[PDB]
Amino acid sequence: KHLKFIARTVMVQEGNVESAYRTLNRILTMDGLIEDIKHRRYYEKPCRRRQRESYERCRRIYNMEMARKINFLMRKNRADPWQGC
């Protein structure tokens, strides 16, 4: 019931349809529509969905913390300033 071609439409620039399609697919993935489509191909039972969401949140937070720790401690990799000791 909406207007057509306003949603998920990308104008091809100079005919590089490959680039335009890549941009469109990037948009879909960023908004998670591909996630929804491929997850809704089949029915995930509510228990499984809850477990999956909890696992995803835990993994996201763990990865964020690990990356932050790695970035924080990377500075110490500088060559030894007291070599020979």
């Binding site: 890549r22 697919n25 990037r26 879909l28 993935t29 960023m30 591909i34 996630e35 491929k38 997850h39 191909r41 089949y42 995930e44 999956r52």
Partner: protein
């Protein structure tokens, strides 16, 4: 085994669909990886995804590194999609069989 063959076909299709999009990662998507085939170990201990290699050595190395880094995420994505209830660890193996044909045709030309 027919079950193993069917599993290989389904996993090949699923992995191709996964790589069709940036779902795994934008970095992986930009590399435009093409999968030659999928083979499951007889005991179901591993799933080898044979991907076609390019001519550029640095590109091959970078693609291999990214694939190794994203294998676990791809496994999780499959198990979440329920394409297979249980998926063994995924191993990405370089494929170079077509080089013989290519260089033959080059010489024969």
């Amino acid at each position: 085994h027919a079950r193993l063959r069917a599993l290989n076909g389904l996993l090949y299709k699923a992995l191709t669909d996964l790589l069709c999009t940036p779902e795994v990662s934008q970095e992986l998507y930009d590399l435009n990886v093409e999968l030659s085939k999928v083979s499951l170990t007889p005991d179901f201990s591993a799933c080898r995804a044979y991907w076609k290699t390019t001519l550029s050595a640095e590109q091959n190395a970078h693609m291999e590194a990214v694939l190794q880094r994203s294998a676990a995420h791809m496994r999780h994505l499959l198990m979440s999609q329920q394409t297979l209830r249980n998926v063994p660890p995924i191993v990405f193996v370089q494929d170079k069989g077509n080089a013989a044909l290519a260089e033959l045709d080059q010489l024969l030309a």
